[PDB]
């Protein structure tokens, strides 16, 4: 007894490259209406693009508004990262943690009003990155606590070792000792999880962290 | 970029009632070849059933054998829990913890040999239940560590309050179908890189 | 602002060797009244010992009784683990999981009645061990939920590699004394508001 | 076989009030050399005080230096918090997360050189607070990973409901349903845990989160 498909207004932050693109293209193939944010380089053919520096609250506000006018209010929000000294630490925190907050907060009133919302946070694949990842999880669990009564869930996807364009650039196999699956994952493997969390099957999952790591984070 | 569907040989333990039945029915509608074990009340209409007491290793072996003949070697195992004194403690541990081991072990040979397997353990919705459920998660994580190299994963679904409340973020109970939805995903081609995970299906309860 | 010392009646299961012995010796030096169970090789010099097979509920009851007479009703229980086929699986589950339940249950009446108790379960340093250890944590959390109102806590110590390595942040093994140090703290007046916790003693390993 | 006591150079951030003071006074009663940071109001009689806004990297630097000259390099660091809109969110993140980083980073070189260090982070007792608490844990686990080989551990203390001066000001008993112990904890109960983590008995605990919550966070 599978729930009939509903085509959602979807926003994928950083949806023009790497894992973000895989997610964006999967969700579009699913039958959703998919928009993406980028840093200026352009949204991939097919999809609706807005330029957004997630460090900037006004840019986020204007982005959501252009999306709203284009395809209706954001129902499904996929938040992708984002990006030792004080400057390096605050930069990653601003992009990856506070950037997640900014987009989540801009999304929340519309989702609460409409009694539908899926916030899906993609954790980064080092003190700054560890801190911002754990912070997003803490934040997501907190959004889940407040908003779930309104049918607005917040869940996290925690990717393990995934083959990106930039992953392939490293001297890499020492990582496989720590992975029970004994292999790297694909961008498509992560996008499959986002697709499920975006579907009508995930309505009773809220405040969860799903690891997509071949067993690594056990 | 969806991966093409593959019809799997599925065994659902306790697939005749409640959460078990909804799982068996969803997987059949998904397009899998679905068999169920049951305690004696009968399989669901149309689906191949076998009577199994999961405290009985020989009854486990017979069931798997009869299923292998019917529809081919078991590729995906959905293990549903079968249900303070020393007697009651050991009973629940035998059914819910050792029972999961018995089915997981009987399934594992053919999964490793054939280089595909998905083990999906559904935790139970007292000291004995707490220990059985936690014991299953530890056992699943251990199987995940051993067999993931052979494309054989082990994951756990942790249901909350399912109808078969203020202290729940969602402020409602879950349906048996919301559980079966997650099992359908775990049994699908989209879950290949998930292994050793506990997916809570509880509307935010166990956070 | 340290709370004054109270000499507790302590039972340490398997307190005759390895981690068990170091725990029993530390607690005795701390100033507690320390008894140990053992498998038959004998108690440590000076300490009151009783032979117990933790798979035997009646042997558990007898031991507690003999200890109550010797030094007074057990106030702090340190439960040390006693140590793939269906036979080997059930064996480890009986000793490490059900064995912990048997001692925890025999201890609990007097702790609730007397409004003080500290249960300290030492996890083991395979599918059976993974399940037993995870099962003990779930059981400890359950006891913690039930009995904490009566000033009866249950906590778990999870030791890593203990000498009784690159994949360890500390880059060394732990001593049996580093484990006993944490048990000493858990048995002390400083631990009253810790209940249902798993304290890892592993140099960062299980992070 | 208890390890002989060693009197450590200790720094307690926010050690002049509430749980911070309890910790500071306990550690001093233990026999450590205890310094505290404050916001201007003064360190409690007995103890060495430095004024430090943990938002300010230069103030942190000068504080550690005054402590070093007074009683020797910081061996034991107790980091106390610290303190929905963007401003409120970034303020709590700056004080509670980046503030933790600042003091941890200023402490680290001396601890690494001397092959001794105990970093103990006291988590706050809401999206901003949840995020910063989870972030500190993520950070601490990351410090533990890098520094433990040099005998520098990082552990977290996660207080449940504790009776402060400010706790007593709230309409409070609805909290007790969620606490198996069925009572509030005392500042002294938390300080007892810090005392253990600061002692010679905690050397093989690193990257741990100890909850002091009567069972609450189970």
């Amino acid at each position: 007894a599978k729930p009939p498909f509903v085509s959602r207004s979807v926003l994928v932050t950083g949806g023009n490259r790497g894992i973000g693109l895989a997610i964006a293209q999967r969700l579009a193939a699913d039958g959703h209406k998919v928009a993406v944010t980028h840093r200026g380089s352009g949204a991939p053919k097919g999809l609706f693009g807005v330029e957004v520096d997630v460090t900037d609250s006004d840019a986020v506000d204007r982005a959501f508004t252009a999306v709203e006018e284009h395809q209706g209010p954001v129902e499904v929000l996929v938040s992708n990262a984002g990006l030792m000294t004080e400057e390096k630490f605050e930069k990653v925190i601003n992009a990856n943690l506070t950037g997640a907050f900014r987009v989540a907060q801009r999304a929340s009133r519309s989702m609460q009003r409409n009694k539908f919302g899926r916030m899906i946070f993609i954790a980064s694949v080092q003190a700054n990155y560890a801190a911002s990842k754990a912070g997003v999880i803490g934040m997501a669990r907190s959004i889940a606590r407040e908003l779930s009564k309104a049918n607005v869930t917040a869940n996290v996807v925690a990717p393990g070792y995934i083959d990106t364009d930039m992953t392939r650039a490293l001297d890499q196999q020492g990582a496989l000792q720590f992975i029970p699956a004994k292999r790297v994952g694909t961008p498509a493997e992560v996008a499959g999880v986002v697709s499920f969390l975006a579907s009508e099957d995930a309505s009773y999952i809220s405040g969860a962290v799903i690891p997509v790591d071949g067993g690594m984070g056990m």
Side-chain angles (χ1 to χ4, degrees), chain A residues 1-16 18-86 88-165 167 169 172-181 183-218:
Chain A
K2 194 193 177 98
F5 178 77
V6 175
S7 173
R8 298 303 181 180
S9 179
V10 165
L11 183 57
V12 184
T13 75
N16 63 317
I19 295 172
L21 175 64
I23 295 169
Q25 280 170 340
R26 174 57 187 259
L27 294 175
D30 281 355
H32 297 295
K33 305 167 276 186
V34 176
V36 307
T37 78
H38 56 87
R39 300 303 311 277
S41 70
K45 269 177 82 158
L47 307 187
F48 186 80
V50 261
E51 185 168 13
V52 185
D53 180 12
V54 294
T55 251
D56 177 352
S57 268
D58 282 296
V60 170
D61 176 39
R62 291 189 310 263
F64 271 75
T65 294
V67 170
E68 290 160 8
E69 295 181 15
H70 167 76
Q71 66 181 46
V74 169
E75 296 175 286
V76 169
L77 167 64
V78 191
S79 178
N80 281 285
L83 269 30
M84 186 74 274
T85 61
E86 181 197 40
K88 289 186 279 168
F89 185 89
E90 298 197 275
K91 253 176 71 61
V92 181
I93 288 304
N94 204 20
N96 283 18
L97 188 41
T98 310
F101 164 82
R102 286 184 184 95
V103 301
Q105 238 248 336
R106 186 51 184 84
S108 68
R109 279 167 258 257
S110 187
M111 291 172 173
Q112 272 189 261
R113 273 205 328 272
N114 281 303
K115 307 282 168 276
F116 184 88
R118 301 293 170 259
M119 302 195 196
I120 304 154
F121 302 91
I122 315 301
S124 60
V125 359
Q126 68 139 129
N128 49 181
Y129 285 102
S132 77
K133 198 257 263 250
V136 178
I137 293 168
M139 188 189 67
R141 290 192 161 147
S142 180
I143 294 155
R145 262 181 203 97
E146 208 202 337
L147 300 187
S148 293
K149 62 171 138 278
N151 186 24
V152 185
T153 68
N155 298 309
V156 177
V157 180
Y161 281 84
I162 311 296
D163 202 42
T164 65
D165 266 8
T167 316
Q172 188 175 232
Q173 40 104 3
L176 306 178
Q177 327 173 64
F178 299 120
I179 311 167
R183 70 164 172 95
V184 176
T186 67
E189 275 162 334
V190 184
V193 185
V194 183
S195 162
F196 163 69
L197 292 178
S199 78
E200 288 286 279
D201 279 318
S203 54
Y204 212 54
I205 297 162
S206 191
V209 175
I210 305 188
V212 192
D213 57 11
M216 195 198 57
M218 273 191 272

